[PDB]
């Protein structure tokens, strides 16, 4: 298909089943739909822990950075386990948010010291 | 920050402004 | 820049709604012939 | 295949009607100042620009007022003067203000930009000249407002890489016989951090459309 | 106050005219807008140069309208501004150039210091001091205090027009204030000092009271807060001067009123600066200290201020003019030759139009 302009992008299409989610990672248009057509699968997400208490992700490095480096984008979720792989720096966001929580369990823990 | 940056921030957002944080805790809170 | 002088007694002026129109009937006309 | 010559047709004279009814800047960029919504589409603008629309000029609101619509001078906006310590401001060279103004308060400017006190080679188009902005320098202050110090701009040069990376690298280097404990390192002295509000390019972005 | 020599017409009488009746080049003027093309600076300059009557000043003022929102605006020539100032005083229509000076957004009217001279001075020698200090404002709108001759004919039209005025507007307080700064930086004597003082003591009242963007907006002046700050900068720099540069007693008293009546929407500044009206204490305090160190050097003056500034205008304006004279020559000459490349420049781009209308 011909799209207007757009660019690749390195995503995470869903699949599984009803409270049961799985990622595709993939390297496809973004104009195109999320579980749609792509160009290629660069590796796959189970948000959900196994008998081993393990989430388990797999990259395909040496395709990532092919795509990465023929000017593919990386959408957000992405780049978080980019991160989380030490593959790229963590994200800004990971470590607001990770502050925002201790921030939060700090307060928590104040209140019940006040109680 | 320095004092000087968030006063400067104060002006831009004045009337939309939350509470300033502080550092956060050295280690997650239990 | 400089200034560019320009005359109206040398310039003609444009014609609006141009017709088209009649130029595509003509063709679906001989078309059907 | 059927020739279609309707769609030829109507592609051409809707080209010749965009092209004979080009919107000007005084009819683009009006703005009501008490619904703060633009005339010409009747689109609200957003809320944080809201006091400036009705505080600050525009930039030829400045320039119309002056000998030669200001060449020369020097103009600033508000938000780099909030933003920024240093001096920033466009040196204008040419103007071309939109003639069907009542008060010619619209139109193009081109100058010499010097943002956060570095002056640039060339002189190029101005963006955001309708934007409720700008602020005109006073030539008894000039000399006072672009006195700048520049001051030793020494920022990291290079970064180590990811953990991942920096291993993989490591790895390689090993599997092919090196042995240099030199650690691998990201360089960025080539990758300078332009500010988000730098001006960009006013000639390559877009014109709304009349309609 | 300028000699007759500097308001002479002579010469401008003199000037090389090519004769036009004014209806042909209004009609060509108007057939030209009728067809939504532009007109050439040579017209409009052909029809402000061949105004004969007070009625042919009131058609010329709106086709200066007229061209001014067209798209040659910005080709209208200096020597047209002139000829349009020099008939407006010729025939009795002072009015008119004031009106097109005033409204110079929707006329284009930027004189050269040469002319507002003629306009203020014309204003003068009929004693009509409103309307010189309008012109004076508008000289200190447009920031064309570059000439030693302007700077002090504004200086007296200012402060003859403050000798006799007791109720302020604060707009009126900004205007006089800023028209008094910009040609008192220019003076390297009492009288610019004291002009700054003054000035400065008027703004930092406005900004006081009706704060800092009603000094700054839509004026030549600065954004940054500290008027007052910056006339008691102005009575330490004459402290510590030669001994030839003394203050007037009248502006100091100016100074000390502001502080003694100042002392009895959107935020621009930042919190962590102190804001002026917190350092009005410390303003009054050092404003008494530097009074009495100015007393203790007899760095004041008793003479008012208007006294002051007739006996510098009979010092300073008759060099001042002559250099304006010689600078006006030669500015004649060169619009002369201009012109003649300009109407050159035009029978060649008529010819080319032409041969491309033959083919
Ligand atoms: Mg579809």
């Not at chain 4, 092919?176 to 360089?187: A, F, K, Q, W, Y």
Request: proline residues 6%; glycine residues 4%.
């Amino acid at each position: 298909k011909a799209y207007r302009g757009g660019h690749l992008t390195i995503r995470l299409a869903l699949g599984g089943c009803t409270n049961r989610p799985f990622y595709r990672i993939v390297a496809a248009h973004n104009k195109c739909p999320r579980d749609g057509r792509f160009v290629e699968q660069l590796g796959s997400y189970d948000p959900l822990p196994n008998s081993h208490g393990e989430k388990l992700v797999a990259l395909n490095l040496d395709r990532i950075r092919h795509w990465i480096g023929c000017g593919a984008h990386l959408s957000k979720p992405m780049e978080k386990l980019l991160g989380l792989a030490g593959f790229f720096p963590l994200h800004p966001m990971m470590i607001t948010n990770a502050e925002r929580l201790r921030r939060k369990r700090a307060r928590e823990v104040l209140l019940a010291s006040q109680k | 920050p320095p004092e000087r940056e968030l006063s400067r921030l104060r002006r831009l957002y004045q009337g939309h402004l939350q509470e300033e944080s502080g550092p956060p805790p050295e280690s997650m809170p239990k | 820049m400089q200034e560019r002088f320009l005359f109206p007694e040398y310039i003609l002026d444009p014609e609006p709604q141009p017709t088209r129109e009649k130029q595509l009937q003509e063709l679906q006309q001989q078309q059907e012939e | 295949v059927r020739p279609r010559l309707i769609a030829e047709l109507a592609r051409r004279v809707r080209a010749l009607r965009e092209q004979l009814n080009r919107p000007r800047d005084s009819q683009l960029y009006a703005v009501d100042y008490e619904t703060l919504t633009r005339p010409f589409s009747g689109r609200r603008l957003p809320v944080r620009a809201w006091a400036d629309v009705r505080r600050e000029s525009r930039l030829l609101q400045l320039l119309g007022r002056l000998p030669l619509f200001g060449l020369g001078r020097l103009v600033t906006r508000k938000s780099w003067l909030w933003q920024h310590d240093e001096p920033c401001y466009w040196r204008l060279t040419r103007v071309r203000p939109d003639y069907t103004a009542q008060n010619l308060d619209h139109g193009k400017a081109w100058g010499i930009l010097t943002f956060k006190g570095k002056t640039e080679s060339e002189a190029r188009e101005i963006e955001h000249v309708m934007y409720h902005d700008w602020r005109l320098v006073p030539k008894h202050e000039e000399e006072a407002f672009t006195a700048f110090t520049p001051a030793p701009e020494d920022s990291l040069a290079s970064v180590p890489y990811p953990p991942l990376l920096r291993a993989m690298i490591i790895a390689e280097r090993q599997k092919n016989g090196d042995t240099s404990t030199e650690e691998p390192m990201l360089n960025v002295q080539r990758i300078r951090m332009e500010p988000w509000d730098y001006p960009a390019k006013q000639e390559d972005k877009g014109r709304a459309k009349g309609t | 106050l300028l000699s007759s020599a500097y308001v002479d017409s002579h010469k401008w009488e003199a000037r090389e005219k090519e004769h036009y009746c004014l209806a042909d080049l209004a009609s060509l003027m108007d057939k030209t807008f009728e067809r939504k093309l532009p007109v050439s600076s040579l017209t409009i300059s052909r029809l402000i140069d061949n105004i004969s009557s007070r009625e042919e000043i009131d058609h010329a003022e709106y086709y200066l309208y007229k061209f001014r929102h067209s798209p040659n605006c910005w080709y209208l020539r200096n020597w047209t501004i002139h000829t349009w100032i020099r008939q407006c005083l010729k025939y009795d229509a002072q009015d008119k150039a004031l009106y097109t000076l005033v409204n110079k957004v929707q006329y284009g009217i930027f004189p050269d210091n040469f002319t507002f001279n003629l306009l203020m001075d014309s204003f003068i020698k009929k004693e009509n001091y409103k309307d010189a200090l309008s012109v004076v404002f508008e000289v200190m709108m447009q920031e064309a205090f570059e000439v030693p001759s302007t700077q002090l004919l504004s200086l007296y039209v200012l402060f003859h027009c403050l000798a006799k005025k007791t109720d302020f507007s604060w707009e009126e307080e900004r205007n006089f204030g800023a028209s008094l700064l910009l040609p008192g930086l220019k003076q390297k004597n009492s009288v610019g000092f004291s002009s700054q003082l003054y000035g400065y003591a008027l703004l930092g009242k406005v900004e006081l009271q009706q704060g800092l963007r009603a000094v700054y907006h839509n004026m030549p002046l600065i954004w940054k807060p500290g008027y007052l700050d910056r006339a008691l900068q102005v009575m330490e720099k004459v402290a510590a001067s030669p001994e030839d540069i003394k203050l007037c007693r009248e502006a100091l008293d100016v100074l000390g009123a502001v502080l003694k009546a100042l002392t009895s929407k959107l935020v621009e500044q930042l919190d962590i600066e102190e804001t002026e009206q917190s350092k009005l204490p410390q303003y009054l305090e050092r404003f008494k200290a530097l009074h009495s160190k100015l007393q203790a050097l007899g760095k004041i003056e008793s003479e008012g201020l208007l006294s002051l500034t007739t006996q510098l205008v009979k010092e300073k304006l008759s060099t001042c003019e002559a250099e304006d004279i010689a600078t006006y020559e030669q500015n004649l000459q060169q619009w002369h030759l201009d012109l003649v490349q300009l109407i050159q420049r035009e029978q060649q781009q008529r010819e080319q139009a032409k041969q491309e209308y033959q083919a």
